Amino acid sequence: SCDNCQPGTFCRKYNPVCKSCPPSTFSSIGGQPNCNICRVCAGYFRFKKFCSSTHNAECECIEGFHCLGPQCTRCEKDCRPGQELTKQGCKTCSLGTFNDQNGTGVCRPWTNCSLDGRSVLKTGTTEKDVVCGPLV
């Protein structure tokens, strides 16, 4: 029977032979009637894993970008200041928080001048921390 075939092959029900998957195709399961066409990673994408007869190629994003979604279906540009990288992609810092860093970092809460026993000299932004004053 055609079900005794190993991975990296294709096999037909009417004439059972475990013929090797040809170049730039693959099969992970076994003795299917076809091989699947190998993925290519170009443009904004790069190869994280390459294709072989047994496994598919897997993609990365280029420098300055990052994978978005389940199986890196798209690339997103790395976050600006005032944004943070989350699972749903770059998102703006919520009120009271900030991030001054470009293409990196995490939204951290504003300095609390009352907690330090000080006055507020300048107000906070999504991209800028509060500036505190003297001690009261």
Ligand X SMILES: *[C@@H]1O[C@H](CO[C@@H]2O[C@@H](C)[C@@H](O)[C@@H](O)[C@@H]2O)[C@@H](O[C@@H]2O[C@H](CO)[C@@H](O[C@@H]3O[C@H](CO)[C@@H](O)[C@H](O)[C@@H]3O)[C@H](O)[C@H]2NC(C)=O)[C@H](O)[C@H]1NC(C)=O
d(CA 40, CA 34): 19
Torsion of CA 54, 55, 57, 59, to 10 degrees: -170
Q: Please report whether residue 24 would count as binding ligand X according to CB under 6 A.
A: no
Q: In the complex with ligand X, which residue's Cβ is closer, 38 or 130?
A: 130
In the complex, the smallest distance separating the C-beta of residue 110 from ligand X, rounded to whole angstroms, is 6
Least distance (Å) from ligand X to the CB of residue 121?
A: 13
CA-wise closest residue to 74 among 82, 84, 62, 85: 62
44 vs 110, beta carbon nearer ligand X: 110
Nearer Cβ to ligand X (6/112): 112
- How far is residue 77's CA from residue 68's CA, in Å, rounded to a whole number? 10
DSSP-derived 3-state class of residue 92: strand
How does DSSP assign 114-128, residue by residue? TTTT--EEE---SSS
Residue 33 vs 117, nearer CB to ligand X:
117
Residue nearest to ligand X (CB): 112
Identity of the residue, 36 or 97, whose beta carbon is nearer to ligand X in the bound complex: 97
Minimal distance, residue 106 CB to ligand X, in Å? 16
Scanning residues 83 to 122, which ones bind ligand X (CB under 6 A)? 112, 114-115
Q: How many residues bind ligand X (CB under 6 A)?
A: 3
Residues at the site binding ligand X, with contacts judged by CB under 6 A:
112, 114-115
